[PDB]
Amino acid sequence: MGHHHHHHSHMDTPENVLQMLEAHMQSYKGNDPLGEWERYIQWVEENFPENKEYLITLLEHLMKEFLDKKKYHNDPRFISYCLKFAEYNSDLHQFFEFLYNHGIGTLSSPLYIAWAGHLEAQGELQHASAVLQRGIQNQAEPREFLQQQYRLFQTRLTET
């Protein structure tokens, strides 16, 4: 929502900023597509310091493009960009759940730790524990970080 709306300005719609890589993605041969997107995630952070609306556009469509790219499921950087996206969105239940259902971050501990941290701050301590154990049984690396955060999480909710 903002195509053709570009007025006299140094800045476009977030859509055009994203379309600058998309036009290049159409006929992209095979020099790793993630390496293109990461350049635009850093580019929007250096060119647009408080204009996060552009960054979020790149991030929400990043998880779409590499969603059914099933070899990027557990990529620590791709999941780290989902964690980067997370702090700008209040729908973290729907977000991290969607990732888990599509296999995104099943072998990534920082995914389960991030969601559990959100849920604790809401009062979803039992559901957050239920997320941390999902990591432990799925063997999400680092597994040791899941187990240490699990027991430290349990020693909190038993006292509350």
UniProtKB/Swiss-Prot annotation:
Upon spindle-assembly checkpoint activation it is hyperphosphorylated and its kinase activity toward CDC20 is stimulated. Ubiquitinated and degraded during mitotic exit by APC/C-Cdh1. Residues 109-142 are annotated as: Necessary for interaction with KNL1. Induction: Inhibited by phorbol 12-myristate 13-acetate (PMA). Changing L132G: Loss of interaction with KNL1. Residues 21-160 form the BUB1 N-terminal domain. Changing A140S: Partial rescue of the spindle-assembly checkpoint activity. Increased rate of chromosome congression errors. Impaired localization to kinetochores and loss of kinetochore binding of CENPF, SGO1 and BUBR1 but not of MCAK, MAD1L1 or MAD2L1. High expression in testis and thymus, less in colon, spleen, lung and small intestine. Expressed in fetal thymus, bone marrow, heart, liver, spleen and thymus. Expression is associated with cells/tissues with a high mitotic index. It is found in: Nucleus; Chromosome, Centromere, Kinetochore. A motif (Nuclear localization signal) lies at residues 68-75. The KEN box is required for its ubiquitination and degradation. Interacts with BUB3 and KNL1. Interacts (when phosphorylated) with PLK1. The BUB1-BUB3 complex interacts with MAD1L1. (Microbial infection) Interacts with SV40 Large T antigen; this interaction induces activation of a DNA damage response and promotes p53/TP53 stabilization and phosphorylation. Belongs to the protein kinase superfamily. Ser/Thr protein kinase family. BUB1 subfamily. Serine/threonine-protein kinase that performs 2 crucial functions during mitosis: it is essential for spindle-assembly checkpoint signaling and for correct chromosome alignment. Has a key role in the assembly of checkpoint proteins at the kinetochore, being required for the subsequent localization of CENPF, BUB1B, CENPE and MAD2L1. Required for the kinetochore localization of PLK1. Required for centromeric enrichment of AUKRB in prometaphase. Plays an important role in defining SGO1 localization and thereby affects sister chromatid cohesion. Promotes the centromeric localization of TOP2A. This is Mitotic checkpoint serine/threonine-protein kinase BUB1. The chain holds residues 1 to 150 of 1085 of the full protein.
